Every structure is written in C-alpha cells, then in structure tokens.
Amino acid sequence: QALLFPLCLVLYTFSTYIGNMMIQPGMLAVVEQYQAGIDWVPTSMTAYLAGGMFLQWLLGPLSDRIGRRPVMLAGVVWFIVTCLAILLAQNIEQFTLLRFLQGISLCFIGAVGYAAIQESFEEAVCIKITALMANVELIAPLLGPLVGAAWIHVLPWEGMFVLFAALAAISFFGLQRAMPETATRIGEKLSLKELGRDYKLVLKNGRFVAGALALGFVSLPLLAWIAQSPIIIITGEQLSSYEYGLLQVPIFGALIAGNLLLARLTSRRTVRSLIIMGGWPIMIGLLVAAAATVISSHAYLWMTAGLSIYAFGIGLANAGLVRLTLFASDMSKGTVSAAMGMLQMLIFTVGIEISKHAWLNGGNGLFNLFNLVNGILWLSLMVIFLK
Ligand SMILES: O=C(N[C@H](CO)[C@H](O)c1ccc([N+](=O)[O-])cc1)C(Cl)Cl
Ligand SMILES: [Pr+3]
Ligand SMILES: [Pr+3]
Secondary structure, X not given: OOOXXXXXXXXXXXXXXHHHHOHHHHHHHXXXXXXXXXXXXXXXXXXXXXXXXXXXXXXXXXHHHHOHHHHHHHHHHHHHHHHHHHXXXXXXXXXXXXXXXXXXXXXXXXXXXXXXXXXXXXXXXHHHHHHHHXXXXXXXXXXXXXXXXXXXXXXXXHHHHHHHHHHHHHHHHHHHHHOOOOOOOOXXXXXXXXXHHHHHHHHOOHHHHHHHHHHHHHHHHHHXXXXXXXXXXXXXXXXXXXXXXXXXXXXXXXXXXHHHHHHHHHHHOOHHHHHHHHHHHHHHHHHHHHHHHHHOOOOHHHHHXXXXXXXXXXXXXXXXXXXXXXXXXXXXXXXXXXXXXXXHHHHHHHHHHHHHHHHHHHHHHHHXXXXXXXXXXXXXXXHHXXX
C-alpha cells in the first residue's frame, strides 16, 4: 500500500548528495560574491563531509531507543533549516560553518534511514531498495557538476540551496505518512559509556581497521577531484564550464562502468580476486596522472585519463572491500558500519585539505603525486589485509 517510504528516503539521499555535488562548481560564484580566495572552494566539501562523520556513531543506537521516525524526520528538517540558513551567511567563514551543519544530515541516511529499511522489508525487497540507493550515489557526482555549472550560468547560487530544501521538504512529507516505526529498543537506556566501549573494541581489531583505512585512502583521489576540479580546470587551466563539465564524464562514467563489470563478474569471482583485479587500473591510473603532470604541469587530459582508469578500478574493487571490511569484525553491523564510515571520512576530510595545499603550492603535479601515495597506502594495506 505504501512504497512512498523507500522512495522518499531515496529522494532525501539524492538531495544531500547534490547538496555536495551541485555546490562544488557553484563555489566559484560563492567565493566571487564574498570576495574570498579560491582556497575556500575545496573546504566547502571538507566541512560538508566533516559534518557527515559528526553524529554517525550516535544516531543508530539513539534511533533504536527513541524511534526511527522522530530521529529521521528531525534530520530532514535540520537539512531544510541549514540549507535555508546559508543564504544569510555574511562571509565565507559563516558559509563554511553552515556547510558543516548541513553535512550532519548525511549521518541520518545510513544509521537510521537504512536501518529502518532493513527492519521493514523482506531480505529480497531490501536488496532492490539498496540497489536504487547505490545507483543514486553513482549518478549524483556525474549529474551534480553538470547541473551545478549550468545553474550558476543563469541563476544565483542561493537558488541551489532553495532547490535542496524544496526537494527535502517533499521528501519530509512522504516520510511523515509512509515511514513505519521499527526501532526495537524503544524505552531502553542509552549509555554513552557502553557505546564508547563498543567503539574502543572495534578499533582494536587490526584487520578491520586496515580495510577501513584502505577504503578511505583509495577513494581519496576521487573525492579530491570532486573538491578541486573547479579550481583546477576553470581558474587553474583557464578553461570554461563546458570543459569542466565534460572532463567529469569519462571519470564518473568509468566509475559506473567499473561497478557494472563488478555486477557481471561477481558470480565467477571471489571478492578477493576482484580487489586484486581493481588494483591494476587503480595503480596504473594514479601512476599515469602523476607521471604525466610531473612531466608537464598542464597535461590535464592525461590527468583526466589517469583518473578515469583509476575510477574504473574503484568501481570494480570498492564494494568487495566494503564487504570484507564489514565481515572482518564480528560486532553489530550498526557499530561496524559507523566505524568504517568515520574512519574513511577522517581520511577524506584531512586528505582534501592536504590535496588543496598540494595543488596551491605545486600545481597539478603535486595534486596527482599526493593521489598516488594514497593508492600506494591502499595497496600496502591490501598486501596485509588479503591472505
Ligand atoms: O567515495 C565513494 N563513496 C563512498 C560511499 O560508497 C564514500 O564513503 C562517500 C560517502 C558519502 C559522500 N557524500 O555524500 O558526500 C561521499 C563519499 C565511492 Cl568509492 Cl562510491
Ligand atoms: Pr556492553
Ligand atoms: Pr553494545
């Protein structure tokens, strides 16, 4: 009678994702309007992502105790408020803090929204819902930059946050009528001390931590590209929004192509073999982008080629490493998931800032060299992690 639930959670998820991806290309208009330096462009995403790791560890056990409905709806509202509130920001510092506060809305998708999905639907229907969510996450970083660039060509950046709030508002009402209460520990006491002990315990698991760290390092080059390609292409290479948008296609296309191959190969390949398989394009790609731009600072097409090859590798290898990492720890999936979520966003957050300084100080060469060491760190962890 009511499938409005998973569909509205999907719409919310989509909106928090363009909440990131549509904004990055817009950030050039943003810093122009505040008369802030281009160094604040990538920090927009850093702050957004830092918000995404802020309440991770807490929302799951909390929504288990007080209800999935109140917590989930609260997150959607928080998203609406913080999106609107950024229109009143008076300087880039204030703009960035709000990016952070908006980012907290991310924590609600996995820890409480998705947990409600698992506690509602048949193990078969739940698979198709998760498939749709994965498609959304795969399409957002492709569509976002393109839509974002075409948006600021005709409309003010403030408009984008109105769009995000509107979409999430639609999504609020759909969840208000169709989301069931599935929390199993309603009324039970939540102990922050026991929660801390849970997390101290998961982190002592060496094999788990290596896999979690590896996921962060390996995805970092992709996130660093999202954060910085606007300043790399437009302000750096003196190119237009058209080239910026176009260079996105081979990169996230290859990501998609990588996940598609993974779909076809999975019945005749173990997770272990697909990771080793992905390792070749992951490494070759990063190597190519680094060598080329060391050789020639402005070889941005070689750079895009390298990153496409790398992105294909990620498509093939990551989901399998996610699975192994999840099952490398025997503790509650809520706890294990939030732990691996926080570990990798720690790497993204710090990594984008280091990346930004690499590019500001040494240009494309440094940008790509830093990406290469991240791949090497993944590779290093995989030699130990695989057995
Ligand atoms: O980097 C990737 N994404 C993962 C999730 O699979 C990463 O943890 C992530 C999560 C959220 C996000 N966001 O909404 O801005 C970005 C990256 C790709 Cl490997 Cl799919
Ligand atoms: Pr306990
Ligand atoms: Pr416990």
